[PDB]
RNA sequence: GGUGCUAAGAUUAAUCAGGAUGUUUUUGUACUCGAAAGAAGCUACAAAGAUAAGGCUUCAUGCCGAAAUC
DNA sequence: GCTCCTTTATCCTGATTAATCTTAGCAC
DNA sequence: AAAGGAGC
């Protein structure tokens, strides 16, 4: 028997084969939707972004904290919000202010503290006098000319505000004293080392340095340091170590082939040569070897991706020969492994300073050869930051003198010398797609071994090129090509900076990206294709916060991380940008070249890469819900894991179970070659891809059965399929927005009713204005200033819509709808409100009466005239029950949000009365009986009492608060229901619209659980237990 | 065809430290009404508060909450 | 009650560790 | 993609 598997991001294809029939004995589906866990991206935002407002707020806390230990201030109920602190901030700094007034000033400056990777105050303050706003980004009018501003400061600078406030403070008041100023500029200032975490002594957490097992990490990212390729427990060796240079080079060595492979006396002749040579590289140690031992008689060398001969040259060691306070040849081995350990995971001076102190001997080290091993880090960068080898150096050294007595390589050393646990292959694996879909692929072959023994061959589909040599030789081109600009990127840099040929290593520290920044940079003709501007070198690299790596579409959307969906632009330029394309965004934008110049320069260079220049101009209004690589680079890695999982195991307990590899191209073009077709949009097509896969290796070896048996019209329609369920509660609870709600009577109410509103965000946009004119055609009255401001609306805007057009002749001749709002912008300014004077504020956003408060989460703040709300309360799981009376069922839906934190515990829960609430709420009786809880994914058989039809869906959620019993069903054997397909008669047909959402509480209706196995097998459930498990 | 070491070129993953926003509440100022006191809560700016629902203990460079465990 | 229709927050700056392909040079 | 009020 034989075993095909097409293992996926979101699905693994399965299917046996008896070999010498063709018979085929199963085919299966399994099915896991990937975005679950790819919505960890989402999860780490959101973290992050706690803990950056986690520590805003706590440093208004500590300053709190620090007033009222200095005695300052005790009552903070009296302090004023509607002064001026900008304005306090600059009187402070050669005036006395209140304790009141400084608080505020010193308030204001903790929350917006500045970046640190004419104080702010004046510079901040005159932007309030002059243009009337601080924050965010904005537009201000220069002499003819739009420029951007934008709410950013450097930490320094606030710092050094900070510092003159309060020491001019100091001559009017005796309360400030030294200390206070010195815990307050911490406070303002201080941050966590990115190698420490989140934590404090006290506050344990696995994110950071302060471990919950109580020890306390010097570097957290030491611990993710790789393992031994062999020693699983050992963790590898620093690149820069000496363990690591010496098997290096010596592996090199013998990989040569020469007219006398070279004696173990004859290595540590270049070793030591090399070694006590300062300068050393590939040709003059060849040089060496060749006139002091004819180089083109050598062979067997590595190969440059141009052509140079290239190989290791024990290039740490002698830059650490280099230092003066020290001095490499006194220490010993372990030693200086564990010196490069320190210098390679380690870029600050706290850092290695620590590592020094904890882990060499108390006397093996002075500040003053720290010193110099902190300016040696820093200058050898380009050394320290290459990484680790893949082996430990336990296995080094268990290899090195074999490398010497004999001529043989590290492959042919280790010959010499000589179920599965899913969760156990997947612990230390940190990609939680790879690790699932590889949890996934282990789980089937368990289950497939159970119910049929072992097999003669288990087959994987990989995607892995074959190339000719055509294209072989097609890739070093381009991969030389794109090595090329990199040295021509920099170099040019190097000659525009320095006129040399070389930047200086200064400029790299604290700003590694430099590299590829000049390198779009050269791209770009040193031009920011968004404003029209040249970007010199001196200003990307001398001040460098004045530009900013956009995504080109949007990463939000596209998910496209790579070098073609990148630009080099100025700062502002790309915050104005948003979430748009260059297409969508540039003409709007108020400081930036015209969409069609940038057309031009697209298009007229010989920079940017095909690729590239598509991204810049595609004219596809590309949205986040329109109907990826990563996709690639973990299918490749799961299928991986499994097949050297599989080898290894069958080896280590020698079950002769083969295990063979089949390309994806191939399957392809067999798949065309045979008589398969696929079905649209349907699941089908990884089972059969798998019997494929399992012929594939059959083939050298009936043949014509299997596949009439695969042909066969009759063959899908009965094939498994099995859905991974989701139980995990806390996922996702809501929708983001956070919406506000008024009493209105809106459209055919008389009385008044809680409308949530809604808002235009900027009615100059064609996006904003088309809203408003769906509203405005609809119900005028929804605007909430054509009731609260009837002038406005009347005598200001709707002139504007009758006297400016909303349409236009384009660039191309083609009329286009033209925003009228915008035309008007662009002549007068921005609309304002009505006014005698002109004086009104302008008008950018208009709130309206969208929708009647349904479901939701209150979020009201104690403050609140009327509620604050959020919306789209995302489900958990359906109870079901079933009341006798009437004899229909009563479906109770949970949502995550129903479940919370309870207070005291800290255990994450719902309570019996609150969930007896919700019971009650749904319209399930109090005496009825519990059958079956569904979560997502999981299968549901509906029957018919009267007509005896029955049809299998998978479960959803249960939708429509308001409709008792409704349940949205998904389809068994493809991703979603088309629209108006046909269901059994009880239910009708799928609304058109392509949810299928029916009540299951009408009185002629049978509903079971219904579980699979990972194989498709499945199993009839009609009731699992006395009550529902609500365990916590 | 699998695999080991090395180097490069491409992609991507996990995790940490920070910035500036956006949403909404309240207040102030402006705009509108009013003789003012104020009203209205539109519109704009500023401040203060909340920012997945919600929790923790050790009082702080405090900690956890959208993934995985099926 | 059953189906149609609208709706849905984001841009960056630092840093480390790991993976998978694809070329190369050697090899079981 | 799916919540759920709008719309009838
Ligand atoms: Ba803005
Ligand atoms: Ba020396
Ligand atoms: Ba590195
Ligand atoms: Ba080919
Ligand atoms: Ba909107
Ligand atoms: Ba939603
Ligand atoms: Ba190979
Ligand atoms: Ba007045
Ligand atoms: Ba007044
Ligand atoms: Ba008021
Ligand atoms: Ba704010
Ligand atoms: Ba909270
Ligand atoms: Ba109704
Ligand atoms: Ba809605
Ligand atoms: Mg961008
Ligand atoms: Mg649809």
């Known amino acids: 028997?034989?075993?095909?598997?097409?293992?996926?991001?979101?699905?693994?294809?399965?299917?046996?084969?008896?070999?010498?029939?063709?018979?085929?004995?199963?085919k299966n589906s399994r099915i896991f939707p990937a975005a679950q866990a790819e919505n960890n991206l989402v999860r780490r935002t959101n973290r992050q972004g706690r803990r950056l407002a986690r520590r805003k707020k706590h440093r208004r806390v500590r300053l709190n904290r620090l007033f009222e230990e200095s005695g300052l201030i005790t009552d903070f109920t009296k302090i004023s919000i509607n002064l001026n602190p900008y304005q306090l901030r600059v009187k402070g700094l050669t005036d006395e202010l209140s304790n009141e007034e400084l608080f505020i000033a010193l308030k204001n400056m903790v929350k917006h503290r500045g970046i640190s990777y004419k104080t702010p105050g004046q510079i901040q303050l005159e932007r309030y006098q002059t243009y009337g706003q601080l924050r965010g980004d904005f537009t201000v009018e220069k002499d003819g000319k739009k420029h951007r501003l934008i709410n950013v400061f450097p930490t320094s600078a606030y710092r050094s505000e900070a510092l003159r406030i309060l020491q001019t403070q100091q001559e009017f008041n005796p309360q400030i004293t030294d200390e206070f100023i010195n815990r307050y500029l911490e406070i303002l200032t201080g941050k966590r080392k990115y190698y420490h975490g989140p934590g404090n002594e006290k506050s344990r957490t696995d994110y950071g340095r302060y471990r919950t097992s109580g020890e306390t990490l010097d570097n957290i990212f030491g611990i993710l340091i790789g393992k031994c390729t062999f020693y699983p427990d050992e963790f590898r060796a620093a690149k820069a170590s000496y363990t690591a240079q010496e098997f290096n080079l010596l592996n090199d060595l013998n990989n040569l082939t020469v007219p006398t492979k070279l004696s173990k006396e004859q290595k540590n002749q270049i070793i030591n040569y090399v070694k006590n040579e300062k300068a050393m590289g590939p040709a003059k140690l060849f040089k060496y070897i060749a006139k002091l031992l004819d180089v083109a008689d050598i062979k067997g060398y590595r190969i440059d991706k141009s052509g140079k001969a290239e190989i290791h040259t024990f290039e740490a060691y002698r830059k650490m020969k280099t230092l003066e306070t020290l001095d490499?040849?006194?220490?010993?081995?372990?030693?200086?492994?564990?010196?490069?350990?320190?210098?390679?995971?380690?870029?600050?001076?706290?850092?290695?300073?620590?590592?020094l102190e904890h882990e060499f001997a108390d006397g093996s080290f002075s500040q003053k050869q720290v010193d110099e091993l902190v300016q040696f880090r820093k200058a050898n960068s380009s050394i320290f930051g290459k990484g680790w080898h893949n082996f430990s150096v336990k296995l080094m050294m268990e290899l090195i003198p074999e490398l010497y007595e004999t001529s043989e390589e590290q492959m042919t050393i280790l010959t010499r010398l000589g179920y599965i646990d899913e969760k156990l292959l997947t612990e230390e694996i940190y990609n939680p797609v790879v690790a699932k879909s590889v949890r996934q692929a282990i789980k089937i072959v368990n289950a497939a071994i159970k119910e049929y023994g072992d097999f003669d061959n288990i087959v994987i589909e990989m995607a892995r090129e074959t190339n000719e040599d055509d294209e072989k030789k097609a890739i070093q081109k381009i991969q030389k090509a794109n090595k090329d600009e990199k040295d021509a990127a920099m170099l040019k840099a190097a000659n525009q900076y320095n006129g040399k040929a070389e930047l200086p290593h200064s400029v790299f520290h604290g700003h590694k990206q430099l590299a590829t920044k000049i390198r779009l940079w050269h791209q770009q003709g040193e031009r920011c294709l968004y404003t029209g501007k040249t970007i010199s070198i001196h200003d990307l690299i001398n001040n460098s916060n004045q530009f900013e790596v956009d995504a080109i579409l949007p990463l939000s959307i596209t998910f496209d991380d790579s070098l073609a969906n990148k630009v080099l632009v100025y700062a502002t330029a790309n915050q104005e940008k948003g979430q748009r394309t260059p297409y969508q965004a540039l003409d709007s934008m108020d400081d930036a070249w015209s969409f069609r110049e940038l057309k031009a320069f697209v298009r007229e260079s010989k920079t940017l890469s095909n690729k590239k220049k598509e991204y810049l101009l595609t004219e596809e209004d590309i949205s986040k819900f329109d109907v990826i690589e990563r996709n690639l680079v973990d299918t490749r890695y799961a299928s991986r894991v499994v097949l050297n999982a599989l080898q290894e195991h069958f080896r280590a307990h020698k079950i002769d179970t083969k295990v063979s590899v089949v390309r994806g191209q191939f399957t392809s073009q067999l798949r065309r070659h045979w008589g398969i077709e696929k079905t649209r949009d349907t699941y089908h097509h990884h089972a059969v891809d798998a019997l494929i896969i399992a012929a594939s290796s059959q083939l050298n070896l009936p043949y014509q059965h299997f596949v009439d048996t695969l042909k066969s019209k009759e063959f899908e329609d009965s094939i498994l399929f099995s859905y991974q369920v989701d139980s995990k509660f806390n996922r996702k609870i809501s929708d983001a927005t956070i919406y506000a709600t008024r009493q209105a009577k809106v459209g055919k109410d008389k009385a008044d009713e809680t409308y949530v509103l809604g808002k235009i965000k900027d009615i100059y946009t064609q996006d904003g204005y088309d809203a408003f004119m769906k509203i405005y055609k609809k119900d005028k009255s929804k605007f909430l200033m054509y009731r609260h401001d009837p002038q406005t609306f009347e005598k200001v805007i709707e002139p504007i819509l009758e006297n400016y057009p909303n349409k236009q002749i384009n660039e191309k001749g083609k009329e286009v709808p033209c925003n009228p709002?915008?035309?008007?912008?662009?002549?007068?300014?921005?609309?304002?409100?009505?006014?005698?004077?002109?004086?009104?504020?302008?008008?950018?956003?208009?709130?309206?009466?969208?929708?009647?408060?349904?479901?939701?989460?209150?979020?009201?703040?104690?403050?609140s005239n009327n509620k604050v709300v959020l919306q789209s309360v995302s489900p958990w799981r359906a109870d079901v029950y079933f009341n006798k009376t009437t004899g229909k069922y009563e479906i109770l839906g949970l949502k995550y949000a129903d479940l919370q934190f309870e207070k005291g515990t800290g255990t994450y829960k719902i309570s019996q009365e609150k969930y007896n609430d919700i019971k009650k709420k749904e319209g399930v009786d109090s005496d009825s009986e519990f059958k079956f809880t569904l979560y997502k994914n999981d299968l549901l058989l509906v029957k018919d009492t009267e007509t005896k039809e029955q049809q299998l869906f998978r479960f959803l959620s249960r939708t429509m608060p308001k409709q008792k019993h409704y349940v949205e069903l998904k389809p068994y054997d493809k991703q979603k229901f088309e629209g108006g397909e046909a269901l059994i008669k009880v239910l009708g047909n799928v609304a058109n619209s392509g949810q299928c959402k029916k009540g299951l509480g009408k009185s002629n209706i049978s509903i079971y659980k219904v579980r699979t196995d990972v194989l498709g097998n499945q199993h009839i459930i009609k009731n699992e237990g006395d009550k529902p498990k609500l365990d916590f």
């Open 1 to 26: 028997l034989v075993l095909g598997l097409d293992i996926g991001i979101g699905s693994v294809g399965v299917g046996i084969l008896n070999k010498v029939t063709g018979e085929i004995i199963h």
């Open 821 to 863: 709002f915008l035309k008007y912008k662009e002549e007068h300014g921005y609309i304002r409100k009505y006014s005698k004077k002109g004086n009104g504020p302008e008008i950018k956003s208009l709130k309206y009466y969208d929708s009647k408060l349904g479901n939701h989460i209150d979020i009201t703040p104690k403050d």
């Open 328 to 355: 490499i040849e006194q220490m010993d081995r372990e030693t200086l492994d564990k010196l490069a350990y320190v210098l390679t995971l380690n870029t600050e001076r706290e850092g290695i300073q620590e590592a």
